[PDB]
Amino acid sequence: SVFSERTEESSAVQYFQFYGYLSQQQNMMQDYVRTGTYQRAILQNHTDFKDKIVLDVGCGSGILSFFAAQAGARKIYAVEASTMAQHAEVLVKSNNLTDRIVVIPGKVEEVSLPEQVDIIISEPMGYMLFNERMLESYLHAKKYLKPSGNMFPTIGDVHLAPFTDEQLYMEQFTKANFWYQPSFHGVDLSALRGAAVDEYFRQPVVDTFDIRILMAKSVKYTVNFLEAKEGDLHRIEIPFKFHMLHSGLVHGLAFWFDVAFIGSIMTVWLSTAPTEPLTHWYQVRCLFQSPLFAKAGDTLSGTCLLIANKRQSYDISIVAQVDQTGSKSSNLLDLKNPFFRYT
Amino acid sequence: RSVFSERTEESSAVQYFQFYGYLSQQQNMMQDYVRTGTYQRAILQNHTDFKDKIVLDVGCGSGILSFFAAQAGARKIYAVEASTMAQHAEVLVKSNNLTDRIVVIPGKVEEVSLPEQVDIIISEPMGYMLFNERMLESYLHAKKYLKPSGNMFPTIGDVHLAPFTDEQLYMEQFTKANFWYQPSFHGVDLSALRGAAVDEYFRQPVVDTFDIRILMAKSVKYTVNFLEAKEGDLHRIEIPFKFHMLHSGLVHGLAFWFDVAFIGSIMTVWLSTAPTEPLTHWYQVRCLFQSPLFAKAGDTLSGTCLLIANKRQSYDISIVAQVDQTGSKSSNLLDLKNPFFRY
Amino acid sequence: RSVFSERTEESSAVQYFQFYGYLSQQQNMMQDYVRTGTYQRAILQNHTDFKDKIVLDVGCGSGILSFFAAQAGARKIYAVEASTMAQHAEVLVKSNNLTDRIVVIPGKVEEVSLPEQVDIIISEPMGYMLFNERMLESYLHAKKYLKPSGNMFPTIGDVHLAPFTDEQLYMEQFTKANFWYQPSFHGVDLSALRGAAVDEYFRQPVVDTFDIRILMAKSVKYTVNFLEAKEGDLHRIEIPFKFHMLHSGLVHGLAFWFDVAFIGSIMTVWLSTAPTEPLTHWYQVRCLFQSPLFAKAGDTLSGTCLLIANKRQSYDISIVAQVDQTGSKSSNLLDLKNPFFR
Amino acid sequence: SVFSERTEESSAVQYFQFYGYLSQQQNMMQDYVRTGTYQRAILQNHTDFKDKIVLDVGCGSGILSFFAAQAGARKIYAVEASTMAQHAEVLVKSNNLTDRIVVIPGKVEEVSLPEQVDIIISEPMGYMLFNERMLESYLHAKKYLKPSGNMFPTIGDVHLAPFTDEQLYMEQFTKANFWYQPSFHGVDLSALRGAAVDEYFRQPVVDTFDIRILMAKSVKYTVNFLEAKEGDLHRIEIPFKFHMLHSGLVHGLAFWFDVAFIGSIMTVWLSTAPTEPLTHWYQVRCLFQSPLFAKAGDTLSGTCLLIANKRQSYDISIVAQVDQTGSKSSNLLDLKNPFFRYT
Numbered sequence A, D: 001s002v003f004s005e006r007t008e009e010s011s012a013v014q015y016f017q018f019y020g021y022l023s024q025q026q027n028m029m030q031d032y033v034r035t036g037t038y039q040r041a042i043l044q045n046h047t048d049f050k051d052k053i054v055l056d057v058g059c060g061s062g063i064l065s066f067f068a069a070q071a072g073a074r075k076i077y078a079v080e081a082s083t084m085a086q087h088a089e090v091l092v093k094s095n096n097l098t099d100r101i102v103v104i105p106g107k108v109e110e111v112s113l114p115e116q117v118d119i120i121i122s123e124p125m126g127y128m129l130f131n132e133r134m135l136e137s138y139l140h141a142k143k144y145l146k147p148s149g150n151m152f153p154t155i156g157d158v159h160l161a162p163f164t165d166e167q168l169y170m171e172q173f174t175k176a177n178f179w180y181q182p183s184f185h186g187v188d189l190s191a192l193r194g195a196a197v198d199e200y201f202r203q204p205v206v207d208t209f210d211i212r213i214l215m216a217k218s219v220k221y222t223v224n225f226l227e228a229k230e231g232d233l234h235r236i237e238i239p240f241k242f243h244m245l246h247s248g249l250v251h252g253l254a255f256w257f258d259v260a261f262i263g264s265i266m267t268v269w270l271s272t273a274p275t276e277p278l279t280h281w282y283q284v285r286c287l288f289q290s291p292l293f294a295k296a297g298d299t300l301s302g303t304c305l306l307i308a309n310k311r312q313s314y315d316i317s318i319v320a321q322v323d324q325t326g327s328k329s330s331n332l333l334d335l336k337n338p339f340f341r342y343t
Numbered sequence B: 001r002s003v004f005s006e007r008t009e010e011s012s013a014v015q016y017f018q019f020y021g022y023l024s025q026q027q028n029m030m031q032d033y034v035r036t037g038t039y040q041r042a043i044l045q046n047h048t049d050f051k052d053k054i055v056l057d058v059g060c061g062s063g064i065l066s067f068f069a070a071q072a073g074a075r076k077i078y079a080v081e082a083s084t085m086a087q088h089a090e091v092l093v094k095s096n097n098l099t100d101r102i103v104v105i106p107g108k109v110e111e112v113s114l115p116e117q118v119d120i121i122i123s124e125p126m127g128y129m130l131f132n133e134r135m136l137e138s139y140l141h142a143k144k145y146l147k148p149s150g151n152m153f154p155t156i157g158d159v160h161l162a163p164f165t166d167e168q169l170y171m172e173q174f175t176k177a178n179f180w181y182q183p184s185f186h187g188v189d190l191s192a193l194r195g196a197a198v199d200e201y202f203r204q205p206v207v208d209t210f211d212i213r214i215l216m217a218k219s220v221k222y223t224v225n226f227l228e229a230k231e232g233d234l235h236r237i238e239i240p241f242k243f244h245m246l247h248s249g250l251v252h253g254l255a256f257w258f259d260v261a262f263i264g265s266i267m268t269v270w271l272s273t274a275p276t277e278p279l280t281h282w283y284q285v286r287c288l289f290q291s292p293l294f295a296k297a298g299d300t301l302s303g304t305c306l307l308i309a310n311k312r313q314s315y316d317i318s319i320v321a322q323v324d325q326t327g328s329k330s331s332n333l334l335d336l337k338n339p340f341f342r343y
Numbered sequence C: 001r002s003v004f005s006e007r008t009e010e011s012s013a014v015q016y017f018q019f020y021g022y023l024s025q026q027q028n029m030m031q032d033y034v035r036t037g038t039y040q041r042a043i044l045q046n047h048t049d050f051k052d053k054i055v056l057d058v059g060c061g062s063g064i065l066s067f068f069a070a071q072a073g074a075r076k077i078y079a080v081e082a083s084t085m086a087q088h089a090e091v092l093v094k095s096n097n098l099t100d101r102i103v104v105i106p107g108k109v110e111e112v113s114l115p116e117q118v119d120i121i122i123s124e125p126m127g128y129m130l131f132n133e134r135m136l137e138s139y140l141h142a143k144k145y146l147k148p149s150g151n152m153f154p155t156i157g158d159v160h161l162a163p164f165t166d167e168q169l170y171m172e173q174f175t176k177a178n179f180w181y182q183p184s185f186h187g188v189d190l191s192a193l194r195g196a197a198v199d200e201y202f203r204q205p206v207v208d209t210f211d212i213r214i215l216m217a218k219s220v221k222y223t224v225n226f227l228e229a230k231e232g233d234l235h236r237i238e239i240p241f242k243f244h245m246l247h248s249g250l251v252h253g254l255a256f257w258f259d260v261a262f263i264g265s266i267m268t269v270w271l272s273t274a275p276t277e278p279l280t281h282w283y284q285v286r287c288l289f290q291s292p293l294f295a296k297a298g299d300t301l302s303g304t305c306l307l308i309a310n311k312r313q314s315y316d317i318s319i320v321a322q323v324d325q326t327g328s329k330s331s332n333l334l335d336l337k338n339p340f341f342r
């Protein structure tokens, strides 16, 4: 199957074991902006669901399918690969919707659907949008979509912006300098200091921050789910050229994302920006190995390259330079194992 | 066929050794001064057990215990580690000018080949509730390389269990499960999953610390002698208990902690994780009853704690407890692999 | 045969009037200075509404309100009381030398005979959640003796309901019901009765007081005009509500309290049992949801509170409420006859 | 029916409405001494239940019948007049004992039983034992008992003792003096002071106390349930002659009770004495209208006459005199409406 060939067994096992916990479902269900916005997006666009055939990709407990039912859907095929699929089956029955919702346990790449659908609903977003590589499953599911179909969400916007956070930057060396001592219980640990530093900077930082740390207007990269193919997400190149609004040291790039549900009646947005109420996605920051100095009016240019790996994630390569001075910095990060810093 | 792989699911082992490949993880355990200091004390104060001896370090990580053995005057130390950390151990050996005495051997101890038999095996195989991670079996497996008169550091392990009362913790866990009682979460009836939820939450052992005044009886001790035990002895561990209740009230579950002893030629050194001792990264472990049992002082609380090893490098825990004077019985099942870190 | 007996089970009435025959009970309400003081204030500052007038005191008890009417210059007061306390009131009338102005008439106001029509009716018919005990119907029934332009003290009653958050109270009641979850109480499996246990406990309205900070929205008010209302109006009371949520969080239920107003010729006097005011023996009443509803600020909480009068001199309470923006719905049933005094 | 003939309907309505609440059942079940002692008496006398026919009078939720089943009874007829009977039926079903326990809704005086039983079990005790008049139902049930049959409990002892409590006595007047003021909001309430005093002294006081207020060894009155007829409890004359242990003012009499389960293997006692842990029966105190002075060595004599009324309770008439001085005092009380003073 498409899924198995692009995914290490070991990763998938852990992955779907994670999503088999009800506390996990509960965690996201209790994120009100997420759940409420989805419900709002579906119900306020009822003409996109009334008497329609629906596919729910990765339905979990099946909540989104129930929203599709509330909107008047004729038939909803709810696909889920984790064991949560049982619990969804329980809920459909207990809610007297066995006639409209069909839970189909398995990976969307492997199961079979009896008919084509009018619309696909899903929540494939991970950290920095792309983490978990579910965007690909969502796009893969379009093999079941009628030429007349819609996708909820319809587009996804990733935003990148340079930031200054002197403390976050110095934090890494404060932690790594543990190894910079010539006699830890009689052992000289110093030789590992460099490797320790390396390890810390490879982790993207998951948390939130004050918007005043942002030093330039964000650059946006858009995925149109109606148009994009799976292969388009194996290699994602985000070129950028930031026009610096403030003077100071740029310590790295901040990431967040929005999705839009473009329905027949209205467009509804779900935003994870630092200007909006906090979600379980938070924001993601990737540090530069060396900060770059820039003055207001200077230009910070370069590329963010995301290469997909078989651990259901991406290798992040970021290169940036201040055009006016020629000061250059790089970093390589492993998105699969971020550092949860939020307190 | 390797012993390790035969008892271990691939997916679990990958994750397992990925976790221990991070330097931050090493730092975290190294910074536990009680642990590190006590190990160094046990080794250095029993230096005659190491002088001009052959040593095996099982799961050496960064290699600190091997360095303690080197400080103690060991003639040759074979330091085995299956994670990538082994590369970092090699660096320290070189930078500390101990290349002639410490030899890092990458791989699983069940799979590597050792050049000679050793005089003593040192290790830190203890996990949560002592038995989590199933490394005790690797530690015991390694005895195939031990001379007939050889020693084990640690030499024995004592598991302690005692009933406790903690209304807050219980209500804390029940409150989480009460989410699934809702008959109309965004219009969806979740109640049918309420039973499954409470099951899931009470399935998690609670890792943290507590005040000793919550203990309602003298602890019961279960001892594993590492010099004598076989791997097979740890596939099914049955711990019978009979507590004489010192206080009246609700027993909400059983608390677990452990001690290990380094029985050397000069002296015996103890490492304790009891709640009467300073806190370690092992903390203490509590298994909640789904239903608390009322008992008065002078009553007897009897039953068994049964540990069945699984292929995820952990144990399925079954606890049965009864108030003998009334016949009030409680039964519970816990998954030790996935505890709730409450601290 | 009488209106009272037809709407009341004998057993309930017996127990009911047995309760009000104790002097300690009388003392208990008289010692509520806010209550008694406000009544005297309402009557005395509106002395012109009593000056040389004919008065009916419905359920006079010890006869205190009648004495206030006497102090205000009333010509003649008919004091009706169905319990045995009526004997004690007559003693006080005699010992206070007011035999010429206060006439005690033993019996139910639905059954006794009055010699003449009155200019004003005084009473204290309020119970828990205002309506408990169903005496308002007796109070309204008594208007058959009121001259056309006559007055009522109190003149109106306002019931207030507001959503609240109180997790501790909720888990307090939830902790109690889980007793019945035990699969081995002395070796006995009680779990099969859990559902019934939760039902029983959450059916009880909670009588006590609380900090006003637990209220999540401005209260909604339901008004009874005693000058206009009929008995029948209180057999089935439907109270619609739409709360505009001021805070985000869990709504654990609805809190109820009431005010009455004495609208006299000189001034209007209010008696309040709100949580912003000093505590009275009416306290406040809260009806819990079996499961709380989450709402964030700006949302709207809508639904209905339905009160059905029963033959035990009380009400069957039905509360249905929903968060409009999300469709989170709750339905609940409470038995006002069986409150929980915490 | 016998029950209807001795009971006013309104009282019966109130009475069985009280016992229809699960919270009420729960409250007695949560009395560990009560429930545990019943269980102990039944289980340690298992030979009195093994393969026997049992009658459970007023079974409530059915707890004692389940105990009888645990002891090995062949058949248990469980009679209950309140609606709780339905709940008992539920538990019988869920505990898979439908073949051994038969719930019979109704009053034991009115229902039909198919056969004679070997033993009757019940908990008919009220305040000072006799309140609620259920002992008569218990004795009435012996029409279904085989000769040589047994009763659990087998006997009941009511204990009386003189007490001194100056505060309790003066309390009545502190409360009644509310009415002794010439201008309560302009009203002279004084004329009702006497009636208020009368009212307070008619109520027996339910609460507990320090045993040090007791001025003599109690006098005991025994009901042997094996020998007694119900009619024996319509008029209960309890003569008393106390040998005063302490000097002082006697303000009244204190009441409590014990029951004994005299089985073939052993006798088990349930005590509500003030020297034992507190139960939901507490203790009962009846005040003299005027205190009597007594010296150590004096004798306090008289009678406590209990006259049963149709409100399922008793009018208590107490007369007492100090023999050596001839100082005499009496009181008449209404046991149906006691004053709960306990804090």
Ligand SMILES: COCn1cc(C[NH2+]CC[C@H]2O[C@@H](n3cnc4c(N)ncnc43)[C@H](O)[C@@H]2O)c(N)nc1=O
Residues within 6 Å of the ligand: A003, A016, A019, A028, A057, A058, A059, A060, A079, A080, A081, A082, A084, A106, A107, A108, A109, A123, A124, A125, A126, A127, A134, A137, A280, A281
């Ligand atoms: C915010 O951090 C990440 N994150 C993301 C989300 C949103 N992603 C739900 C995916 C849900 O979809 C399921 N899923 C993923 N790949 C799937 C596939 N090929 N076939 C079928 N179901 C699949 C998966 O089991 C889970 O139930 C969330 N609900 N919680 C989170 O913690």
Ligand SMILES: COCn1cc(C[NH2+]CC[C@H]2O[C@@H](n3cnc4c(N)ncnc43)[C@H](O)[C@@H]2O)c(N)nc1=O
Residues within 6 Å of the ligand: B004, B017, B020, B029, B058, B059, B060, B061, B080, B081, B082, B083, B085, B107, B108, B109, B110, B124, B125, B126, B127, B128, B135, B138, B281, B282
């Ligand atoms: C729950 O906390 C307990 N805990 C315990 C310890 C002590 N446990 C060392 C295992 C170390 O031993 C290694 N290891 C495990 N099984 C092994 C095996 N067959 N062969 C070789 N090395 C092995 C593994 O890679 C790790 O480096 C720790 N260093 N951190 C902790 O967090």
Ligand SMILES: COCn1cc(C[NH2+]CC[C@H]2O[C@@H](n3cnc4c(N)ncnc43)[C@H](O)[C@@H]2O)c(N)nc1=O
Residues within 6 Å of the ligand: C004, C017, C020, C029, C058, C059, C060, C061, C080, C081, C082, C083, C085, C107, C108, C109, C110, C124, C125, C126, C127, C128, C135, C138, C281, C282
């Ligand atoms: C605090 O909440 C309960 N509560 C209420 C009140 C206020 N309710 C006075 C009724 C008083 O009026 C009497 N009463 C009730 N229905 C009556 C009727 N058809 N005809 C004549 N008298 C009646 C009844 O006997 C009592 O004396 C209070 N005085 N104490 C309380 O404890």
Ligand SMILES: COCn1cc(C[NH2+]CC[C@H]2O[C@@H](n3cnc4c(N)ncnc43)[C@H](O)[C@@H]2O)c(N)nc1=O
Residues within 6 Å of the ligand: D003, D016, D019, D028, D057, D058, D059, D060, D079, D080, D081, D082, D084, D106, D107, D108, D109, D123, D124, D125, D126, D127, D134, D137, D280, D281
């Ligand atoms: C603390 O003192 C009061 N008290 C006493 C007791 C002990 N008395 C049980 C009576 C139980 O027996 C029942 N009962 C009484 N007369 C009955 C009758 N002719 N026929 C059948 N059942 C009858 C009654 O419905 C209740 O289930 C208790 N279980 N709770 C209390 O609160």
